[PDB]
Write a protein that holds these residues in place. Structure first.
Motif, PDB file in Angstrom:
ATOM      1  N   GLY A 188      33.709 -37.901   3.285  1.00  0.00           N
ATOM      2  CA  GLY A 188      33.026 -38.226   2.272  1.00  0.00           C
ATOM      3  C   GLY A 188      31.357 -37.832   2.414  1.00  0.00           C
ATOM      4  N   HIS A 189      30.628 -39.007   2.251  1.00  0.00           N
ATOM      5  CA  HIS A 189      29.250 -38.677   2.519  1.00  0.00           C
ATOM      6  C   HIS A 189      28.676 -39.552   3.671  1.00  0.00           C
ATOM      7  CE1 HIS A 189      29.535 -37.270  -1.363  1.00  0.00           C
ATOM      8  NE2 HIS A 189      29.775 -38.287  -1.979  1.00  0.00           N
ATOM      9  N   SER A 190      29.858 -39.727   4.637  1.00  0.00           N
ATOM     10  CA  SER A 190      29.417 -40.815   5.751  1.00  0.00           C
ATOM     11  C   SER A 190      29.680 -39.738   7.115  1.00  0.00           C
ATOM     12  CB  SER A 190      30.911 -41.915   5.831  1.00  0.00           C
ATOM     13  OG  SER A 190      30.540 -42.516   4.741  1.00  0.00           O
ATOM     14  N   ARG A 191      28.502 -39.512   7.710  1.00  0.00           N
ATOM     15  CA  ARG A 191      28.689 -38.781   9.072  1.00  0.00           C
ATOM     16  C   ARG A 191      29.186 -39.773  10.216  1.00  0.00           C
ATOM     17  NH1 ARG A 191      29.179 -37.067  13.193  1.00  0.00           N
ATOM     18  NH2 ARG A 191      27.912 -35.381  14.632  1.00  0.00           N
ATOM     19  N   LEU A 192      30.204 -39.170  10.640  1.00  0.00           N
ATOM     20  CA  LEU A 192      30.867 -40.097  11.671  1.00  0.00           C
ATOM     21  C   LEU A 192      30.284 -39.876  13.331  1.00  0.00           C
ATOM     22  CD1 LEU A 192      34.459 -39.234  10.415  1.00  0.00           C
ATOM     23  CD2 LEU A 192      33.515 -41.687  10.331  1.00  0.00           C
ATOM     24  N   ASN A 193      29.238 -40.588  13.410  1.00  0.00           N
ATOM     25  CA  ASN A 193      28.117 -40.302  14.530  1.00  0.00           C
ATOM     26  C   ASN A 193      28.196 -41.866  15.009  1.00  0.00           C
ATOM     27  OD1 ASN A 193      26.344 -41.135  12.794  1.00  0.00           O
ATOM     28  ND2 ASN A 193      25.031 -39.815  13.142  1.00  0.00           N
ATOM     29  N   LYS A 194      28.724 -42.782  14.877  1.00  0.00           N
ATOM     30  CA  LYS A 194      28.692 -44.088  15.642  1.00  0.00           C
ATOM     31  C   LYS A 194      30.261 -44.543  15.490  1.00  0.00           C
ATOM     32  CE  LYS A 194      27.347 -48.291  14.886  1.00  0.00           C
ATOM     33  NZ  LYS A 194      27.168 -49.438  14.222  1.00  0.00           N
TER      34      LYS A 194
END
Length: 106
Positions: free
Chosen positions: A32-38
């Motif tokens: 979606g609009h969520s960067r998976l960087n955590k």
């Protein structure tokens, strides 16, 4: 450096398989609009939130070295384990790349 979810294996008949996700050469970096960087449960949460619904991933392919947008439909009814139907590992891109680069058949 840049962190994401390395794809490790795609169960048969899965939403993963139907969307064309590559078991080891794909690197999931957005849902979606969520960067998976955590390293949190954001991936699971947005898969849950979008069950039986179309949701766009950004995925980096380690053969072609570029990003595409894959549409996936997370779901219960496909038959196996999980909404996506895939195994993933959170890591830097550096680490996922070196673990696929120099494999040897013997």
């Amino acid at each position: 450096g840049a962190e994401g979810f390395h794809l490790h294996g795609v169960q048969e008949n899965s939403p993963a398989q139907q969307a064309g996700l590559e078991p080891y050469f794909d690197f999931i970096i957005t849902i979606g609009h969520s960067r998976l960087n955590k390293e949190n449960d954001t991936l699971k949460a947005l898969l849950k939130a979008n069950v039986e619904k179309p949701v766009k991933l950004e995925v980096f392919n380690m053969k072609t070295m570029r990003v595409r947008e894959v549409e996936v439909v997370p779901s219960n009814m496909w038959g196996g384990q999980g909404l996506l139907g895939a195994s993933v590992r959170f890591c830097s891109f550096r680490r996922a790349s070196e673990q696929v680069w120099h494999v040897l058949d013997v």
